[PDB]
Paper text:
Anopheles gambiae thioester-containing protein 1 (TEP1) is a complement-like protein that plays a central role in the opsonization of gram-negative bacteria in the hemolymph.
The overall structure of TEP1*S1 is very similar to that of TEP1*R1. The pre-α4 and catalytic loops form part of the TED-MG8 domain interface that protects the thioester from premature activation or hydrolysis. Both loops are ordered in the TEP1*S1 structure. TEP1*S1 Glu 966 adopts a different conformation than Lys 966 in TEP1*R1, directed into a pocket occupied by a Cl− ion in TEP1*R1, within hydrogen bonding distance of Ser 921 Oγ and Phe 923 N (the same conformation observed for Glu 1098 in complement factor C3).
Residue numbers in the entry: 22 to 560, 563 to 574, 583 to 605, 629 to 821, 830 to 1338
């Protein structure tokens, strides 16, 4: 017996099991079949038991109809033999839930921080068409901590394809991410992608023979190449050591390498023993200024002959008895075919001997004929010049050595006859055939040849075979089963997509014509990967879709299982990038030719492309189109990130020439907008050109000596060209020109609100500096035109990093409230809200809470804030992990005391908020505030709230601190408490009033916050008019961006301001602003209250008084922004900072010892979350981990190396009197002369006034110590 059926079952699938009786002992065979099944629960699902007789020399096809109600578990078919026949074999069956399978394509395997992950999702049914059932999917992407960063709740498919993207933020969560698609609630497919940060001063060296060495050369030529992980070439010295005879030193050369270098190593006498001898070469690369060394060793092979030979076998093994063709490929050492090598090829095992010469294509073709008994084939080649080559060819792993071959003798048209040619070793009594389509046996048959070896098998192509089917033939020779498969693909009914390149060569930077043809109106999905990108990461989506295009067990591959008798056996006969993420339609007729620009870069490409027609299904190209591009010539910069005014700077560059010859290069550094003064040249010079000879495959330096003129951003503009201008390259890089001192701009603000036509005159005493006047028709115009960066301070902590999140909610809040017709803004804010969400997930802890730090530092304050913060944002973005919020609110709820009180579990970094020294009134009121602002949260946690509101009620007459009370009041105001009015009046009673200014604030330490909470409660209690003097103060405390100086104040402040201005600003703006100063009078007009992005500058020169006349109806802010360039000088206020530059014994290394401690006062003996910034003198750069000597009194909770290693930021928890110290290690990596001094700063985060700055000087170098001979002044 031969029992064969599918190995898979489906809900409503037929199961046709085909039994063949060739056993001739009996005249019939009686069989019992049981197909049992059991769910994962343990419930019995299947007990379909059938009995049948299979007569001699025929087939019986059995159908098992499957119950619609199948669920995954444990299934198997059992063919046990009844009556007089001893037979019992069984085979386990798998459940396939879906009639569809899916594919996730991603443009890269790994991503650098600021990248955009691109993905396609492809759904295909069992016919390789787009599923007519499924219209959309459910795609979510999770970060390395499983957080739901994005989500497509209803991702509509087009031609079974969903295309989308995801931006990885500036400072993201590193590791493995997880795209996962879901259909009808069941996960269909899942792909991972990685995110790694490629920083550090770590570099790689490679050594290779520039030309494959011959014995005849008596010399080794080398290419030495050292690049940083960044992609930039390394400058340094290469120490070369060559070893000809074992570990005995033969030679030592040294060369300065600028990324790429050539070295020649000559020998005295080198006679080899064989025709190939290895040579060990050690290279030691010493990084230019640090002296950091990387050693690379390699075995460089030397050869006797100028050619090598390989054997091009038609197949890896020969079938004994059948002609085995092959050839010898003669390859020149690196390159051509060896056209004309004479020799004799000898295969003794067939008795074949030929003396010939390699042809034009460099080949000698062997068409051997091994007989029935041939073990190995000894292909031996001996040449007239003595060259020797022998490689053995072995026979196919003969499980039988008696085969059956099936050959489809004509094209497979639908309905038309299918003709096949069966060839078999034995004279056949019988053969079986089976036909699979859509995972089940469609047709079978017991064919009986008349003791023949050949049979012309003729079958009708039925409709159940459309469009992809597969036929399988089997028979018995001896007591072993032999078989063969054949593909039955109706080409006339399938997607015949093809993609091609032009008949021209591919030049990097130039454009190429892509010619593709296929089904009209079909979807096409192009992608091009860097072949080097498919390195350690893929070694790849293409194989999966290649595998999905069609279909060593040739049954389990055909989707079947096979059983036979106990004595019968089975046979077995066997810089970088990402570009061209396009998707096009075949359209018009039968081909669409898209035209594209090849990236200007030295890289090996890999170009794929699939196609999906709604009718015709999937199409694919065979091998991905593959080429490489070598950019002829390019320049590479090596520039400091920041320089100061009046320092002399060497801008280094490196030219690479990849052309055949050595050509002179011109490099021209341009003076863009008076930015750049070339040292020793007339100031009116617009450019400066130098010219250098550049050898092939060698890096050559070229530098310019400059000093910066204007502050801000210096554009470093360079054009280059070799070979008379035939090959050009240019770069547009930027060095940032910093002031000498830590500059901080002040901004005085006035606001007007006129409902009825009103004239008024606002004076502005301006009392070195530069001034700018701004009129802004909305609180948020300055804010939104700054969103992505609102604060002058770093924000690398859980609380601070919310500036990327919260301000966006509030800007979205307002725009929807007022019903803004400026969708243009809403878009920016909504986009930034999402990226803000992702950024913040980095501060999620394991227990569901949020912490001040990435790894540690869990916090109650923060958890309340972040949790409820997100709950609000939910109405503006789909992507929020709804349960993740709930689980964060639940962590919070449990942390409450029995009184209803909340304490901060973990260190104190925001004192007024996290201080328990005042009944924890602050934190309690805050947490209650957070819960109350969300309708879901208010109901779900109502019991926790009720306990808190009572704790406040019992505390109300006891609260005597303005901060605490302001929130307690806000809580009650939101709550709708009975004692709300009381609370607010007790707050009002604490207010500082200045009637000679129309200002009202709430005092001591955290004024901006307290006052904001206060105003919120006002607007709540409809005290709008009384809120106007409150606002007047707040608006005047704003930072230049439109926000407030710090994090929290911004958050509560902007909230307060928008809230009042919602209820006080007139429905229509129609007014004129007259600006009188010095001599001039400027005029501004506002007539559309609508528009937000609406800028009104004017730069007053250093004048005296300033007089503004507002006339009409509307809202407005009159801002006057003083910006300061001051002298850099030491200052201390309630912090004591000290600097000491320890000795290193190297000019090219700075180590600075820094010491900072808080100066206490009265009850205040400890600071808030304190940061230290370290600025380096121009040219210096900090390494990977530049900090050492760290004190354990107060430990650095977080480090931030920003600004291309110019600045190190150091987050502490707090500072006491106990000295907190460390030591920075920087390296002078750029030539900068006349260096102006740097500084270190310590500050309290949430208290502006408490800070300390200390200046320090490094050896300020001179112009002569730095200039190249051409640019040098006479004094050298
Ligand atoms: C290429 O794929 C994109 C999906 O990114 C398809 O663009 C969508 O087209 C439909 C109409 O067919 C629109 O309703 C969507 O708004 C489009 N989405 C986007 C993001 O623009 C497009 O169908 C595909 N094919 C071609 C030829 O452009
Ligand atoms: C040009 C220059 O400054 N060269 C110095 C050299 O004088 C000094 O002896 C050495 C360290 O010992 O470092 C280098
Ligand atoms: C299944 O049903 C058949 C016939 O109805 C019976 O003979 C057999 O015992 C049953 N098997 C199981 C495992 O329940
Ligand atoms: C190796 O390079 C050196 C220097 O460029 C040259 O003298 C020699 O001809 C080269 N050898 C070969 C085999 O190209
Ligand atoms: C298949 O083709 C036609 C269907 O109309 C039929 O007449 C013929 O008998 C069939 N059989 C074979 C063996 O081709
Ligand atoms: C170039 O820069 C400075 C800007 O402070 C200015 O004083 C100087 O006159 C400028 N020169 C020209 C030609 O604009
Ligand atoms: C406002 O000022 C203008 C011009 O100075 C003056 O004519 C007028 O009295 C004022 N107008 C109103 C409507 O108050
Ligand atoms: C590196 O070696 C050079 C050799 O001149 C020396 O000047 C310098 O002091 C060394 N730097 C360090 C960091 O050891």
């Amino acid at each position: 017996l031969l029992v064969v059926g599918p190995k898979f079952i489906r809900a409503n699938q037929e199961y046709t099991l085909v039994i063949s009786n060739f056993n001739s002992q009996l005249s019939k065979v009686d069989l019992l079949l049981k197909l049992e099944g059991e769910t994962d629960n343990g419930l019995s699902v299947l007990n379909v038991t059938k009995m049948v007789d299979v007569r001699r020399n025929m087939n019986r096809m059995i159908n098992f109809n499957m119950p619609e109600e199948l669920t995954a578990g444990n299934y198997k078919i059992t063919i046990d033999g009844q009556r007089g026949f001893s037979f019992h074999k069984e085979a386990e069956l798998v459940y396939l839930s879906k009639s569809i399978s899916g594919l996730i394509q991603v443009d890269k395997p790994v991503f650098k921080p600021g990248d955009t992950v691109n993905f396609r999702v492809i759904l295909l049914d069992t016919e390789l068409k787009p599923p007519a059932r499924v219209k959309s999917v459910y795609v979510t992407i999770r970060d390395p901590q499983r957080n739901v960063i994005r989500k497509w709740s209803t991702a509509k498919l087009y031609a079974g394809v969903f295309e989308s993207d995801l931006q990885i933020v500036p400072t993201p969560m590193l590791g493995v991410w997880n795209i996962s698609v879901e259909v009808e609630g069941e996960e269909l497919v899942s792909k991972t992608f990685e995110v790694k940060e490629y920083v550090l001063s770590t570099f790689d060296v490679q050594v290779m023979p520039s030309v494959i060495p011959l014995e005849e050369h008596q010399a080794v030529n080398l290419t030495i190449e050292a690049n940083y992980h960044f992609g930039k070439p390394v400058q340094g010295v290469a120490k070369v050591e060559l070893y000809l005879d074992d570990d005995k030193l033969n030679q030592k050369k040294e060369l300065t390498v600028y990324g790429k270098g050539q070295v020649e190593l000559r020998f005295d006498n080198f006679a080899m023993d064989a025709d190939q001898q290895d040579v060990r070469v050690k290279v030691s690369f010493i990084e230019q200024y640090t002296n950091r060394t990387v050693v690379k060793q390699s075995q460089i092979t030397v050869y006797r002959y100028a050619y090598r030979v390989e054997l091009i076998k038609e197949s890896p093994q020969f079938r004994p008895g059948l002609p085995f063709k092959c050839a010898l490929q003669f390859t020149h050492h690196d390159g051509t075919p060896a056209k004309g090598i004479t020799g004799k090829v000898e295969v003794s095992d067939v008795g074949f001997e030929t003396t010939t010469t390699s042809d034009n294509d460099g080949l000698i073709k062997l068409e051997l004929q091994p007989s029935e008994g041939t073990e190995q084939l000894g292909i031996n080649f001996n040449a007239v010049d003595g060259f020797f080559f022998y490689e053995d060819v072995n026979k196919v792993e003969t499980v039988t050595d008696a085969y059956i071959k099936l050959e489809l003798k004509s094209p497979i048209k639908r309905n038309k006859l299918m003709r096949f040619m069966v060839t078999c070793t034995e004279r056949m009594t019988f053969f079986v055939y089976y036909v699979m389509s859509k995972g089940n046996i469609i047709d079978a048959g017991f064919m009986r040849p008349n003791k023949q070896t050949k049979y012309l098998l003729q079958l009708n192509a039925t409709e159940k075979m459309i469009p992809k089917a597969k036929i399988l033939i089997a028979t018995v020779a001896g007591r072993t089963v032999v078989y063969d498969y054949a593909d039955l693909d109706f080409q006339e009914l399938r997607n015949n997509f093809d993609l091609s390149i032009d008949e021209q060569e591919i030049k990097p930077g130039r454009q190429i014509e892509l010619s593709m043809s296929g089904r009209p109106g079909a979807y096409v999905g192009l992608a091009a990967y860097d072949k080097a990108l498919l390195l350690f990461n893929k070694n790849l989506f293409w194989e999966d879709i290649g595998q999905v295009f069609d279909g060593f067990d040739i049954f389990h591959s055909l989707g079947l299982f096979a059983r036979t008798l106990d004595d019968i056996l089975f046979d077995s006969a066997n810089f970088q990038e990402s570009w061209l993420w396009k998707n096009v339609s075949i359209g018009r007729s039968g081909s669409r030719k898209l035209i594209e620009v090849v990236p200007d870069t030295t890289t090996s490409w890999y170009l794929t492309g699939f196609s999906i027609d709604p009718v015709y299904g999937l199409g694919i190209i065979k091998k991905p189109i593959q080429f490489t591009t070598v950019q002829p010539f390019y320049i590479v910069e090596n520039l400091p990130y920041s320089i100061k005014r009046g320092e002399a700077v060497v801008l280094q560059f490196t030219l690479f020439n990849n052309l055949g010859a050595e050509y002179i290069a011109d490099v021209t550094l341009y003076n863009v907008a008076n930015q750049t003064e070339f040292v020793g040249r007339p100031d009116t010079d617009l450019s400066y050109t130098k010219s250098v000879s550049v050898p092939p495959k060698v890096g050559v330096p070229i530098s310019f000596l400059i000093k910066a003129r204007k502050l801000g951003e210096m554009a470093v503009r360079v054009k280059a060209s070799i070979m008379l201008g035939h090959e050009t390259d240019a770069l547009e890089k930027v060095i940032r020109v910093m002031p000498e001192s830590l500059a901080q701009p002040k901004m005085d603000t006035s606001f007007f609100c006129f409902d009825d036509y009103k004239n008024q005159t606002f004076p502005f005493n301006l009392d070195s500096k530069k001034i700018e006047f701004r009129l802004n028709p909305n609180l948020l115009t300055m804010v939104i035109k700054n969103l992505d960066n609102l604060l002058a301070v770093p924000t690398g902590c859980g609380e601070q990093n919310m500036v990327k999140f919260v301000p966006n909610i509030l800007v979205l809040d307002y725009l929807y409230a007022t019903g803004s017709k400026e969708q243009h803004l809403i878009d920016k804010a909504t986009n930034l809200l999402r990226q803000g969400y992702q950024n913040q997930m980095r501060y999620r802890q394991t227990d569901g809470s949020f912490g001040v730090w990435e790894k540690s530092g869990s916090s109650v304050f923060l958890t309340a804030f972040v949790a409820t913060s997100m709950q609000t944002a939910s109405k503006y973005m789909n992507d929020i992990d709804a349960a993740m919020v709930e689980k964060a609110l639940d962590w919070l709820a449990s942390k409450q005391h029995s009184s209803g009180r909340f304490d901060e579990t973990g260190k104190v970094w925001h004192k007024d908020m996290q201080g328990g020294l005042r009944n924890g009134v602050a934190l309690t009121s805050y947490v209650l505030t957070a819960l109350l602002e969300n309708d879901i949260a208010k109901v779900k946690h109502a019991v926790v709230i009720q306990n808190g509101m009572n704790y406040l009620s019992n505390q109300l007459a006891f609260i005597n601190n303005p901060y605490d009370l302001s929130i307690a009041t806000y809580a009650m105001m939101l709550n709708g408490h009975t004692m709300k009015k009381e609370a607010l009046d007790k707050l009002i009673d604490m207010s500082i009033s200045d009637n000679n200014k129309k200002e009202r604030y709430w005092g001591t330490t955290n004024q901006i916050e307290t006052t904001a909470y206060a105003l919120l409660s006002f607007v709540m209690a409809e005290k709008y008019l009384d809120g106007i003097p409150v606002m007047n103060w707040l608006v005047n405390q704003r930072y230049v961006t439109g926000s407030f100086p710090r994090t929290q104040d911004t958050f509560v402040g902007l909230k307060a301001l928008t809230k009042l201005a919602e209820k006080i600003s007139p429905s229509r703006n129609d007014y004129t602003v007259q600006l009188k100063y010095k001599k001039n009078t400027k005029y501004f007009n506002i007539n559309s209250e609508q528009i937000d992005v609406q800028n009104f500058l004017e730069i007053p020169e250093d004048t005296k008084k300033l007089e503004i006349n507002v006339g009409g109806i509307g809202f407005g802010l009159l801002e006057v922004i003083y910006q300061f360039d001051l002298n850099l000088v030491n200052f201390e206020h309630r912090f004591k900072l000290d600097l000491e530059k320890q000795n290193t014994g190297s000019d090219y290394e700075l180590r600075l010892r820094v010491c900072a401690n808080y100066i206490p006062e009265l009850t205040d003996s400890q600071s808030n979350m304190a940061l230290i910034e370290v600025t380096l003198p121009s040219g210096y750069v900090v390494d990977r981990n530049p900090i050492s000597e760290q004190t354990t009194v107060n430990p650095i909770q977080n480090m931030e190396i920003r600004y291309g290693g110019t600045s190190v930021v150091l987050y502490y928890y707090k500072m006491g009197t106990e000295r907190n110290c460390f030591t920075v290690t920087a390296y002078r990596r750029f030539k900068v002369a006349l260096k102006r001094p740097a500084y270190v700063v310590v500050y309290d985060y949430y208290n502006t006034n408490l800070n300390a700055i200390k200046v320090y000087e490094v050896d300020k170098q001179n112009v002569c110590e730095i200039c190249e001979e051409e640019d040098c002044p006479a004094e050298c």
